[PDB]
Amino acid sequence: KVKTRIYFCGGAGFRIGELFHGYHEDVCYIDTSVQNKHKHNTDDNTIIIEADTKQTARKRAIGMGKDRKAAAELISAHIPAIAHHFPAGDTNIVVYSMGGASGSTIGPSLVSHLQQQGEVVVSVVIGSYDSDISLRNSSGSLKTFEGVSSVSKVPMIINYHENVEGIPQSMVNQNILEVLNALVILFNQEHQSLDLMDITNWAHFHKHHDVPVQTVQLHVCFDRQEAQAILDPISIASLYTDPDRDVSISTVLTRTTGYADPEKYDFDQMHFVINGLSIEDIRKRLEERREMMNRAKANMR
Ligand SMILES: Nc1nc2c(ncn2[C@@H]2O[C@H](COP(=O)(O)OP(=O)(O)O)[C@@H](O)[C@H]2O)c(=O)[nH]1
């Protein structure tokens, strides 16, 4: 098994994968049309699941209407095939927008399948509210998250980014790139005192502490302060280049701790904090911000 397999799904996924090209080898792409393909998609790393046009309206409903029910109908028979062509790694990262129809159905469907096979999985996702469609789909995706946790009986881990009004998608994408780079490092199995089983136990915290299975949020923090401010942590993994200064025995006992080689890594410390996720809180925010946008009728010049 590769150490980390990344699955880029739908339009946002393809765009991020394009930006991430060269940062990791074991990546792949899945979509419901060819329209999002770019120079790095090939038959070896890309699967396209399309309506058998042997269906103009249905494709329009999926592609332009972003009808998630229609999209999920289209892709559901092919999910096990995807995992067969693009085998799961020791860790897996699935990347998708919540507001469209392809990523927001392929992605969580894949996460569910992989978790049912016992795999460690993280999603890096994007909430949006640029339209009524985006808002409704993003709300639906939050509920899909709870269904993945319930169906697969493994906590679905969500690293959440939001398309805030006035912030270019290119800057959200760059934040996602930094997260992807951090995860690849965390998962590379090259650090002292951090093995495959340590990461598996951090992610599948339900098998080791018996908190109920629930959807959870992953926060990636690049300094001690960000990490500490996170409310009610459930499971934390931390990587330090200066344990002599920063790591006590209490930290080792209460946290998934690893030592990164200061001869090789340039960061001080990285914290990967899993805590509870309230889909209700995120839905309300998206709705409030959509209303504020509607009332503003404003563009940043
Ligand atoms: N941050 C970010 N958002 C995106 C990107 N592409 C699309 N979006 C937003 O994601 C939502 C769904 O788009 P998309 O991923 O293309 O839909 P899909 O192909 O059906 O899964 C819309 O709100 C888009 O504005 C991207 O590259 N970066």
Numbering used by the authors: 4 to 57, 61 to 307
Quote the study on this structure:
In this study, we looked at the protofilament contacts and filament structure formed by TubZ from Pseudomonas bacteriophage ΦKZ. We have solved the crystal structure of ΦKZ TubZ in the monomeric and polymeric forms, revealing structural changes in ΦKZ TubZ during polymerisation and showing that ΦKZ TubZ forms canonical tubulin/FtsZ subunit–subunit contacts and a functional tubulin/FtsZ active site. The crystal structures of ΦKZ TubZ revealed that it exhibits a tubulin/FtsZ protein family fold consisting of the canonical N-terminal GTP-binding domain, connected to the C-terminal GTPase activation domain through a conserved helix (H7). Tubulin/FtsZ family proteins frequently possess N- and C-terminal extensions to the conserved core, and although ΦKZ TubZ has no significant N-terminal extensions to the canonical fold, it possesses a flexible C-terminal helix (H11) similar to that found in Bacillus TubZs, C-ST TubZ,5 and 201Φ2-1 TubZ (PhuZ),6 which tails into a long extended coil at around residue 300 (of 327).
We solved the structure of crystals of ΦKZ TubZ to 2.0 Å (R/Rfree = 0.17/0.21); the asymmetric unit contained a single subunit of the protein in a monomeric state. The GTPase active site within the subunit was occupied by GDP, which was retained by ΦKZ TubZ through the purification process, and only the extreme N- and C-termini and a single region of surface loop T3 (residues 58–60) were not resolved within the electron density. The monomeric structure of ΦKZ TubZ exhibits several clear and interesting differences from those so far obtained for other tubulin/FtsZ family proteins. In terms of primary structure, there is a significant insertion within tubulin homology loop T3, which forms an α-helix instead of the conserved extended loop found in the majority of tubulin structures. Given the role of T3 in forming the subunit–subunit interface within a canonical protofilament, this would preclude formation of such a protofilament without significant rearrangement of the secondary structure. This is not the only such surface change, as the H10–S9 loop within the activation domain also lies in a conformation that would clash with an adjacent subunit and the partially disordered C-terminal tail prominent in previous TubZ structures lies across the subunit interface, blocking polymerisation. Combining structural information from both homologues, we propose that Pseudomonas TubZs may occupy a different conformation as a free monomer, surface loops being incorrectly ordered and the C-terminal helix and tail extending flexibly in solution as found in the monomeric ΦKZ structure.
